[PDB]
Amino acid sequence: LETIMASPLNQQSLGLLIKERRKSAALTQDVAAMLCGVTKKTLIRVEKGEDVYISTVFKILDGLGIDIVSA
Amino acid sequence: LETIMASPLNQQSLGLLIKERRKSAALTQDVAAMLCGVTKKTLIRVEKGEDVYISTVFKILDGLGIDIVSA
Q: Do A70 and B10 touch (CB under 8 A)?
């Protein structure tokens, strides 16, 4: 039962997680923005790790089927 | 808790997670707010699931030693 040193999410890596999930689902920023109910600009801000309201982030996570949990 | 950490997170359950973790460490709202570098009022907002900036949430999470990860 190998005990490894991994890392928790911060603001930047969350954006990158979102980006990777959007890309793996073959969705453009426009389409994903449509699915998540945000503007392309907002999605772009989030993927870049720029500060927004948590509600926006949860809309994005929910729209892309990304689940986050407590460690 | 066990109902919150055995499910993916939303805004409300995140706030409740913060609250419970704070309570398990025997911390008042003032002290925890102090530890996290936010106001008591802000911590109260987050624990109640009210909308704030993601940076604030990450400050609270980091200050209380709560790690979140991708599922």
A: no
